[model samples]
Target chain A: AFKNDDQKSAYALGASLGRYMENSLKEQEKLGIKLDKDQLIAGVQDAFADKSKLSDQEIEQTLQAFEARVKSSAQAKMEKDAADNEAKGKEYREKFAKEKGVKTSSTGLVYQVVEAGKGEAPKDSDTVVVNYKGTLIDGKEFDNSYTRGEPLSFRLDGVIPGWTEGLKNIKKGGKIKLVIPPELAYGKAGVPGIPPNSTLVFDVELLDVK
Target chain B: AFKNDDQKSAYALGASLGRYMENSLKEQEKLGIKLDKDQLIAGVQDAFADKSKLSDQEIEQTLQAFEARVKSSAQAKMEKDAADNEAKGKEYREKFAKEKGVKTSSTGLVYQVVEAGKGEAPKDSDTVVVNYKGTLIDGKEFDNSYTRGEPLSFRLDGVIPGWTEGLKNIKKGGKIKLVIPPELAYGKAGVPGIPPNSTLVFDVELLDVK
Candidate 1:
């Protein structure tokens, strides 16, 4: 397909560039921007052909306007989603609280001990091995150590405040269900795959505590 | 679309379940497993309708086989992908090393000091605010604080080994380009967005160190 490394390199670079722009277009589509493909191709070829329909000043101004719309649209979508999620999460937590054996703490961490294992509880300094499944308020799972076929172990000092506090109700060989408010979880600073201010549900089995 | 909260809630749960299945199907498609969507719906409705084509024993055996295939298939795909990434990463590091003024460390971290800004360097315990852009080998951008219009502040104790080692080459107010190998980056354990054993590139500006 190629005569030499130079030819292959050129084609590879072109292909990668095209892929990058394709992703950019789709990402903007997710953010409520509908960009014309023909216009995009036209701009690319127009610059190469040494001819243009828009002046440099016009291009700059148009792009600045596009950036403005992108931010505004994104912020609007986020605000609505955040508001709806918080309402649903609160409703779910309140409903769960009515269930037998469940308890909601003053710090807003909710827990229900399913198994009262016969052992001493783990200290804050101990490294605990656990199998867990995590889900959003709507029951969409975000992570599962059970599916990974491995138990995760972490020192209590390194985990979120939710896990540290929630684990207080369970000992080794115990099972617990925790509904964590965001303040004790990711809070306003969300990690990937989780949104900001999300209320999370976790089912944890304490396999051992070292 | 709904007249009451109960009706709305029911529809919402069904919608969320549908979305989850769609994502699951999409994931298995990437793993080279394609299941008929119509057949999946048929099975769900059949079970609900108290009629099913396959017997309970047959269904259980089929599902066991499916799970076995999933494990073997996923392992095969990831092994190939990870090895290919490592090869490409090595090639990129060697190529970057050939460039003028770039240096490769004994531990395989490559760096180039872009601007020799006048100032003292940051101590290990000091908190620093940095503006940075991160990319993969193919120029796929993963993070950019510049686009966020804000610099990120962090203590050196909480970041990856790559950032810790790379930042040592640049003082406060200076700019540097770092090409970090997987060992000094994510290593064998990758986060949500990053693939396992990825070689990362970063352009960083040390805004402030206190």
Candidate 2:
């Protein structure tokens, strides 16, 4: 209990402001955004004390400028990554095309057969079970169902363009190596561990065609 | 290695799509967003098979419609909460006004002096120290400096309007009960655990006026 009204009111105000700031800070952390804590506190104090030199219009302008800078920086970084990945993907595919027994399709898909199967091939509508190892052109492994000791099952037309066209050439119990171009794989915006415009390689064994 | 081109392409496409979906799902979780997993998969399959009935424009329109609905629902919830809080706050204040020894200010602030102090009251620019226990009108405690074994200090003008006016009536070493209206505390959007438009009560003992 406060001895006087002055003490009580000040404490209440402090508690209110403190909680508001705490909530705002928590939300910012969740969004992976950062703010200058010292500056924020100083700004609040200055405004409260009526000592701030910046007008409301000036403050709004500063925020607008800051937002513009952040947006442009992000855009620039993405553009640079996309250009770099495209060049690297092109170079990787050219070298892969010169390998022995490798064939390139009209759509720029490259592949090499490792094992022949005697059973029937799968159509676009058919589901197939297969074991596979996926990697970037730089030989960095990204995903593998083989390592997990389980074959994956999916319809022929349910995957990327590279797989939809390539899988139809093999029957059940077949194995193949595929070198996929960026357009046939993850394109301008790639998946985790796979950079934008990246080319991908996969070694796969078809266990069953249903 | 694939036995044939079809097998290679299909496996590569499957790997690519699998990785893409995995990445997308992880990001959605991080953002605390939800989606219908079965519907997402079915939509992808339809697009891949060129069997989707919706055009590009139609797909974009559908997404915009979803976003608008989400925004409106959130806005509506907040508005309803505010309205309920406003009514409750007014009701609480009207009943509190009838308490014994309680006085209401021109601005609707209610207070009762418990112990008179000997010194001068604090100016708006002066800082004061005090102990306090704060609660909602329903007697649910939200804050307590006494429990923490410490007194709080702040400038009188830096607090809420109710505190600024109420605290001015007491000097150092005085005790008082303050019944703060919503406009004098946190307004429509109240602090955590404190509902919107809440009326707050505080038992305060002023320790020092500096």
Candidate 3:
């Protein structure tokens, strides 16, 4: 309190660094790393006092090991979550298959024919306009062309395997429901909205084909 | 411990709800809204007990009024911040204009020709290729065609007023430095990398004009 602006600024910088470190410590906790706050403070203090015990190389190697351990743990956790999701999706498919108009394909695609349009079915090379709502196995809505107020048009061969196979089952002006497993959708490597090893459900209306 | 699975489930639900509401309360605080947590808890408690004093319509009206207040406060705060930015920009421009070989235009564009090319100048309709590094008044770089390892090509009239005016001062194979005011650049509503009412500085290299 008796010092000048420089002293006050020093204290402010320390507080700012402390706040940033606090968030880093808390975030690491989610990955099962319990960082010791006292040790953290001691390291900074020791550096300031020029009495650091370990060489810079030792500190760098230790940090590298810690980062590698966290990465391994995160991968293991993701594998467990993916397994659980696959099991849940299987259960949903089993129940869905028992529905009145539902049918199963050779590639594990389960679908129901909502409307059988009289028009001819489109092939892989043809472009088709469709409105679809896609969701996860747990009913979390991911993509909805209906909400966007536009029907999307794409060549059948340009889309995911499930869409290519499932859309071939419906004709222009037809409506259908599809349950696609990970093998036929995004697979183990997912796109922006779709997660890895996910099961996708879609309600599609075939508007036109050319 | 004294109850069934339903009791455990109830506690879990409450914990989840509490986490969400805690974040909401803290977020409102940033907007200068200090909400009373005790009243919030009481509102939920009373609703559970079927003893809410306010009717559904009254509660709806109260929420509407609160939302309006927050919106109005946010706009006023934005205006204050924009004014501060404009003032800071003016201060930068005033100092930058004092540099050697600097020249000011009638529209307040200040620039220094680093290299005067022997090639012809480009008109507004002509396409031009250039490499440039653009920054704010505080020297925070926003765009850099140099880092992307490619020059950008655009018609003179397609860019901001500053670039259209500034580029005409230099010809093909020339280099220049431009310090453009808000009025000649993004006046108030800025794009993704730039802030509102910001002054822009650019080191531009005119490679070609067609």
Question: lDDT tens digits, residues A54-152, model 2?
Answer: 455555555566456446656666678889988988898888889988889899999888886769998878999999999988889999997888899
Worst 10 residues of 2 chain A by lDDT: A4-13
- Cand. 2 Cα-lDDT: 0.71
The lDDT for every candidate, in the order shown, is 0.73, 0.71, 0.74
TM-score for chain B of all predictions: 0.90, 0.65, 0.69
Candidate 3 lDDT over A1-210, as tens digits, reads 314322322233233334445555566666666555434444444333344443445455555666676688777766776787778878898899898999999999999989977688989799999999999988889999998899999999999999899988988899999999988988766678877778899999999989
* Number of the top-ranking candidate, with TM-score as the measure: 1
CAPRI docking class of candidate 1: incorrect
Model 3 C-alpha lDDT per residue in residues B1-210, reported as the tens digit of each score: 314222222332233334444555565675787655445544544443345555556555556666676678767866876898899989888887888988889988999999987587878998999999999878799999989899999999999889998889889889999999888988887776777788999999999999
Question: Model 3: which residue pairs collide?
Answer: none
What TM-score fits each model?
0.49, 0.43, 0.46
Docking class of 3: incorrect
Residue ranges of candidate 2 with Cα displaced over 4 Å: A1-60, B1-210
In candidate 2 chain B, what residue range of length 10 has the lowest lDDT sum? B5-14
Clashing pairs in 1: none
